[PDB]
Amino acid sequence: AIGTWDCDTCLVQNKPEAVKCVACETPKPGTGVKR
């Protein structure tokens, strides 16, 4: 797993340290592959 993900619900990127997006606090689903 890369360990990094971007939030497309509000165009905001989050780093591995993040947990819940600041603008909308995304659940941060755990997915091995983004695609």
Interface with Zn ion (CB under 5 A): 7, 10, 12, 21, 23-24, 26
- Residue 3, annotated as binding a ligand: no
Tokens describing residue 32: 């091995």
The CB-of-35 to Zn ion minimum distance in angstroms stands at: 19
- Residue 31, annotated as binding a ligand: no
- Residue 16, annotated as binding a ligand: no
DSSP notation for 1-35: --S-EEETTTTEEE-TT--S-TTT-------S---
Nearer to Zn ion, 1 or 24 (CB): 24
